[PDB]
Amino acid sequence: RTFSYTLEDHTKQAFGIMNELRLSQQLCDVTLQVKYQDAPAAQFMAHKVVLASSSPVFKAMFTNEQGMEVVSIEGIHPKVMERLIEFAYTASISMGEKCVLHVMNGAVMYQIDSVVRACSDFLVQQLDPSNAIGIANFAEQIGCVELHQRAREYIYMHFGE
């Protein structure tokens, strides 16, 4: 008859090693160059296949061919991209409250929907009269319909509307 084995946390151990390889700059076939405003240029080595596995945008980019590619990024802060890359390689992201808007914007641009959803839910929790308008505005700018609606609903509710 049949011998069948599953290692539950194999994908975690494997991502651990893929992250080690990233930081050692081993087997990296993509370089992300990030330029923001009047800030120093930042460079991030990574593996196309790991990026494609976490982002439909990277998947579309790289499946549409063998050799180092450079992706030049403008108007995104290096620490935003570093946080998204670390998410792709670890499944985790941790940051100050003031970072959430810039990261959610990053996440949207590379369709890391789970991070968009995490950021969105967080801001809906933090809604108050001071921030409601800014958040609503931001939501409209970056195109997050659900965050915009929750924020607009929270504002017009203060006027029995």
Ligand X SMILES: *c1nc(S(=O)(=O)c2ccccc2Cl)c(N2CCN(C)C(=O)[C@H]2C)s1
Q: Which does 6 bind (CB under 5 to 8 A by kind): ligand X, its own copies, none?
A: its own copies
> How many whole angstroms separate alpha carbon 28 and alpha carbon 62?
13
The two tokens of residue 112 are 């890391």
The HSE-up count of residue 115 (CA atoms within 13 Å, CB side) is 30
Q: Which of residues 142-161 bind its own copies (CB under 8 A)?
A: none
Closer of 71 and 127 to its own copies (Cβ): 71
CA 157 to chain centre: 31
Residue 5 in contact with its own copies, rule: CB under 8 A: yes
Question: Which one among 77, 110, 119, 150 touches ligand X, defined by CB under 6 A?
Answer: 77
Is the Cβ–Cβ distance between 32 and 61 less than 8 Å? no
From residue 160, alpha-carbon distances to 134, 146, 157 in Å are 21, 21, 5
Pairing of strands 42-46, 30-35: antiparallel
Least CB distance from residue 41 to its own copies, whole Å? 14
| Chain contacts with ligand X (rule: CB under 6 A) | 77, 79-80, 95-96, 98-99, 102
- Can you give the binding site for its own copies, defined by CB under 8 A? 1-8, 10-18, 21, 24, 26-27, 29, 47-50, 52-54, 59, 61-63, 65-76, 87-88, 91-97, 99-100, 105, 109, 114-115, 118-119, 122, 126, 141
